[PDB]
Amino acid sequence: HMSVYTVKQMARLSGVSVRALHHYDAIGLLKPRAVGANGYRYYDRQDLLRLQQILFHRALETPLKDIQAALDQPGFDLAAALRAQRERLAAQAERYARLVDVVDRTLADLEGDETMDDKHLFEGFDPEKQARHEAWLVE
Amino acid sequence: HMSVYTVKQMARLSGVSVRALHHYDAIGLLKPRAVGANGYRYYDRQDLLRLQQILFHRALETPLKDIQAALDQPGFDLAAALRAQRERLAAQAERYARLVDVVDRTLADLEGDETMDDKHLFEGFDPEKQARHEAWLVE
Numbered sequence: 412h413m414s415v416y417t418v419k420q421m422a423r424l425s426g427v428s429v430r431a432l433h434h435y436d437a438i439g440l441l442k443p444r445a446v447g448a449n450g451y452r453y454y455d456r457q458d459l460l461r462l463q464q465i466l467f468h469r470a471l472e473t474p475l476k477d478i479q480a481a482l483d484q485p486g487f488d489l490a491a492a493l494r495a496q497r498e499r500l501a502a503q504a505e506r507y508a509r510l511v512d513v514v515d516r517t518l519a520d521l522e523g524d525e526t527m528d529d530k531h532l533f534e535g536f537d538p539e540k541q542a543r544h545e546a547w548l549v550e
Numbered sequence: 551h552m553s554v555y556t557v558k559q560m561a562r563l564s565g566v567s568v569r570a571l572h573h574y575d576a577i578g579l580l581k582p583r584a585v586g587a588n589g590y591r592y593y594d595r596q597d598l599l600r601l602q603q604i605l606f607h608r609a610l611e612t613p614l615k616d617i618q619a620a621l622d623q624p625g626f627d628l629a630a631a632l633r634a635q636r637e638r639l640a641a642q643a644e645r646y647a648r649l650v651d652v653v654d655r656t657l658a659d660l661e662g663d664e665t666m667d668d669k670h671l672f673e674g675f676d677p678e679k680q681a682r683h684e685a686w687l688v689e
Contacts, residue, residue, distance in 0.1 A: 507643035
């Protein structure tokens with residue numbers, strides 16, 4: 412809330428390194444807002460929430476330049492951004508949980524009479540991740 | 551089980567493109583084993599299980615060359631490989647579910663008195679994904 416943090420403290424609190432925070436600072440992505448009377452710069456609550464936004468974007472494989480754009484958007488609403496991120500994180504949790512179900516079904520067939528239909532081997536894989544890989548194979 | 555598939559059929563069944571399967575074939579990753587009397591090559595059940603292994607590896611961001619190595623390992627046990635993949639897929643599902651919890655806790659603080667401790671903003675992020683990004687920032 413009123414707490415403010417040096418780079419050393421922000422690293423320890425967030426798990427982002429001092430190296431990364433200096434880089435995020437240099438490129439205008441995350442600049443410590445709070446300034447003391449000694450000219451030192453400190454991360455405040457608003458900076459912590461922006462860094463959390465950066466970590467959510469990276470969890471969701473958003474590329475570094477796209478992050479700046481998304482955060483600096485005029486009329487940026489943090490609660491809206493969080494709800495959109497929730498939906499995409501939930502969908503990733505459901506994909507991974509579906510892929511465990513596929514492993515479970517495959518193991519049981521495999522240690523059973525091996526009668527399970529072939530198509531059931533392949534339900535659950537991310538079509539998006541396949542397109543980005545077939546596109547790569549065309550070099 | 552006894553079913554065998556052309557490239558066109560294997561694409562339709564698996565969701566992998568004809569382009570990718572020809573590439574997987576060329577580089578020795580997945581070569582249709584079953585051969586007919588007309589010299590044509592067909593994917594059998596064992597090929598379907600190897601392709602499922604490739605799709606699990608790609609879900610778990612294993613690099614293409616590492617896949618060959620892992621599948622061609624002497625004493626390769628498919629049920630062992632599946633159980634190891636289960637554990638890593640489950641862990642990804644738990645990470646994504648934890649990140650939704652973090653969003654939920656943050657939203658409720660944000661629309662509340664904003665008293666939640668700062669450290670709670672940052673629990674749940676993948677430290678591995680952070681190291682691979684701080685390492686990248688050193689170019």
